Amino acid sequence: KSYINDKGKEVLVLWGIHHPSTSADQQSLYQNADTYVFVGSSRYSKKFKPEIAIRPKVRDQEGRMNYYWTLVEPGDKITFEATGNLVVPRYAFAMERNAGSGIIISDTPV
Amino acid sequence: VSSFERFEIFPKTSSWPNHDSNKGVTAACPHAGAKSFYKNLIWLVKKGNSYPKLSKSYINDKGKEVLVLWGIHHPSTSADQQSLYQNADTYVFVGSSRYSKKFKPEIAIRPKVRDQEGRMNYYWTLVEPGDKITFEATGNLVVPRYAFAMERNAGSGIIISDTPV
Amino acid sequence: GKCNIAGWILGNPECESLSTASSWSYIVETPSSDNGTCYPGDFIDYEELREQLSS
């Protein structure tokens, strides 16, 4: 699945890669046992390989989900390819970054 | 560091019934002329002609951070791979609540350093109080033996000097 | 509100009620804002993303 940036501005695209706890879970979700995910644009290019193993339960989960992001330039295409384990984008974000601010962590009311 | 306690995270005598925990020595790490190896790690090697799937967990019950170090061995040749681990196509996985990485031995001849054409990469992570770290491997894993419960203090630095204490 | 940037930008269900304007000058989190990655894992270059999104 490909998307061409026709927003006239940068688009932040985020996706996830799922790493199941067990071979059973791998098969139960995606059927294919040996899968990959590939994400590519004009400037980004990365192949991912699910790492199946039991992690300590966090929020009841022994699996893990890694989250990735990139900025697609106006007019560029980003391509997703997968045989499993891809948390695909549904919403993405057209944005214009201005200079540089920061993040205040405070109970102070707005 | 305000507190530092070495402990045997995976006891050498009981942890590895299905693997050989004695042959993992090397002339690159001599101790009193004999081949040896790191004290805090064990170079696990096939037991007889079998390296069964390894799995080993440790839950942090020290009420403080635990520093765990491990190694990944990258043999020089496919031959060395079989001689140590039998399995030709192996992996190692290390995972906690916060760490997650699958390793793949990269088998090739490197230029000889300290007589070795193979390589060993060393990894570490800090296990939070109450968290589990899991090791999975079908070969090539230099397992932890001792780990370290610790309390990091503020921020110092490292002086490199011949000046005497 | 009670979400962090990870939770907000991924659309963690606890953040759906937040309003998001078309521009902003900085970001505010609370010290108790920890509705983030509700499925555990790593957010790659998270701090870089935060800085990118700050204004």
Would you kindly state where each structural domain of chain B is located, as residue ranges? 1-165
Inter-chain CB proximity A54 and B102 less than 8 Å: no
∠ CA A79-A85-A91, rounded to 5°: 55
The β-bridge relationship of strands A103-105 and C27-29 is parallel
CA distances for B72 relative to B35, B133, B134, B141, C25, angstroms: 19, 16, 15, 5, 46
Q: DSSP assignment of C1-55, as one string?
A: --B-HHHHHHT-GGGTT----S--S-EEE-TT--B--SS-S-BTTHHHHHHHH--
Q: Which residue has the tokens 């560091």?
A: B1
What is the SS3 assignment for B60?
coil
Inter-chain CB proximity C28 and A66 less than 8 Å: no
Q: Tokens in use for B39?
A: 């004290």
Nearest to B118 by CA among B160, B66, B81: B81
Strands (DSSP E) found in B13-158: 26-31, 34-36, 41-43, 54-59, 65-74, 92-95, 100-103, 119-127, 132-137, 141-144, 146-151
Find the closest chain B residue to C43 by CA distance.
B98
Find out whether B86 and B49 touch, Cβ atoms under 8 Å. Answer: yes
Please give the CATH superfamily to which domain B1-165 belongs.
Answer: Haemagglutinin, alpha/beta domain, HA1 chain (3.90.209.20)
Measure the CA–CA gap between B100 and A19, rounded to whole angstroms: 9
Find out whether B27 and B99 touch, Cβ atoms under 8 Å. Answer: no
What was the structure determination method?
X-ray
What is the SS3 assignment for A50?
coil
Report chain B residues whose CB lies below 8 A from the CB of A22.
none
Report chain B residues whose CB lies below 8 A from the CB of A54.
95, 134
The total of other beta-carbon atoms located within 10 Å of residue C22's CB is 6
Find out whether B115 and B27 touch, Cβ atoms under 8 Å. Answer: yes
In three state form, how does the secondary structure of A4-35 look?
A: ECCCCCEEEEEEEEEECCCHHHHHHHHCCCCC
Inter-chain CB proximity A58 and B100 less than 8 Å: no
Find out whether B41 and B120 touch, Cβ atoms under 8 Å. Answer: no
